[PDB]
Amino acid sequence: TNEFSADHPFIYVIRHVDGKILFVGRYSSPT
Amino acid sequence: DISFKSMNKVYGRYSAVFKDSFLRKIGDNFQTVDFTDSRTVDAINKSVDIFTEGKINPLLDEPLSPDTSLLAISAVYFKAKWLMPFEKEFTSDYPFYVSPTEMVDVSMMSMYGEAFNHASVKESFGNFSIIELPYVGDTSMVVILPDNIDGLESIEQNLTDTNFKKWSDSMDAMFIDVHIPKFKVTGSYNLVDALVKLGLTEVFGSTGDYSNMSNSDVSVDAMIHKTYIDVNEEYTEAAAATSAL
Amino acid sequence: MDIFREIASSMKGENVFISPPSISSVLTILYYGANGSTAEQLSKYV
């Protein structure tokens, strides 16, 4: 079973599919 | 856009004489104002507050200089349900490695056995995986997760629009279990220092030449970006606003 | 992605969340009133 476990710093992008980037972030730490 | 909406507003001091070429390029997003009047900032802030469904408020947190000549603002707003929502039943406390030997509690959302667009990417600056979590409609969240527990910085600093498109294009449907934090974050950024470091050395302050705005000297001394995001089991909500003045 | 990378590298270990289009829209307004080296430096962001 493959795993995607975002339990260490990651980047996340909100985008239009086939299109532009709307927002981009780095998750470094729990707030 | 249906999930994403944007607006821009430009405010010029009423005592300045503006050039029509500039005004034509701006469109019907321009008005003149009196920056010596205190309710002026209140009315601009209320505009952004309402547009961003309360999430950016106030954009302008300092009284405005009565000598301001031009204020340019943008605001954007996004809210969409996940195409496949997370089950709260599966959300629980997990260690988050802020560094390889420092663990901080996070509320982790989990989804098992479903299929998502995904790729395993091998690069000289680090190996990683990328997944796409779709929203209802035509947007998605793409997440980039280093294979090494503290491997993000070298990938981050090689993230370009072209790379990102290349990795995203390589994704294919695969069954994979997904674990990602639930989180809310607010940001506030002074963009002047970053943009100077990127080469905008004659944009802010006295070297800035905005002589094509009007018959008078216009200077832009500051530029702020304020943001909000809420990622939870049912939806993502995001907002941002930018001001230069 | 250049603005994101710069902000991120400027606040190591901190969360970062930005909207590139929002930022580009204000830089584009500046570009319309700009002249000389100022316009040239802003044109990449329009």
Locate the domains of chain C by residue range: 1-46
Task: Count CB neighbours of A13 within 10 A.
Answer: 22
Joined together, the tokens standing for residue A23 give 């927002």
Distance from CA of C28 to the nearest CA of A (A): 16
Q: What determination technique applies here?
A: X-ray
Residues of B in contact with C2 (CB under 8 A): 160, 198
Do the strands B177-181 and A3-5 form a parallel or antiparallel pair, or are they unpaired? Answer: parallel
- B145 vs A8: CB contact, 8 Å cut-off? yes
Give, as one character, the DSSP assignment of residue B82: B
Give, as one character, the DSSP assignment of residue B64: P
* Structural resolution in Å: 1.6
Pick C1-46's CATH classification: 1.10.260.40, 1.10.287.580, 3.40.50.970, 1.10.8.60.
1.10.287.580
Domain that holds residue B244: 1-77+186-228+239-245
Closest CA to B242 of B98, B59, B93: B59
Q: What is the CATH number of the domain that holds B199?
A: 3.30.497.10
Task: For residue B187, give the amino acid letter.
Answer: G
Residue to mutate among A8, A24, A29, with most C CBs inside 10 A, is: A24
- The C-alpha atoms of residue B77 and residue B73 are separated, in whole angstroms, by 14
Tell me which residue in A13, A25, A29 faces B98 most closely, judged by beta carbons.
Answer: A29
- B183 vs A2: CB contact, 8 Å cut-off? no
B210-244 exposure pattern, b = at least 16 Cβ within 10 A, e = fewer: bbbbbeeebbbeebbbbbbbbbbbeebbbbbbbbb
Residue to mutate among B2, B4, B111, with most A CBs inside 10 A, is: B4
Number of domains in chain A: 1
Residues of A in contact with B104 (CB under 8 A): 29-30
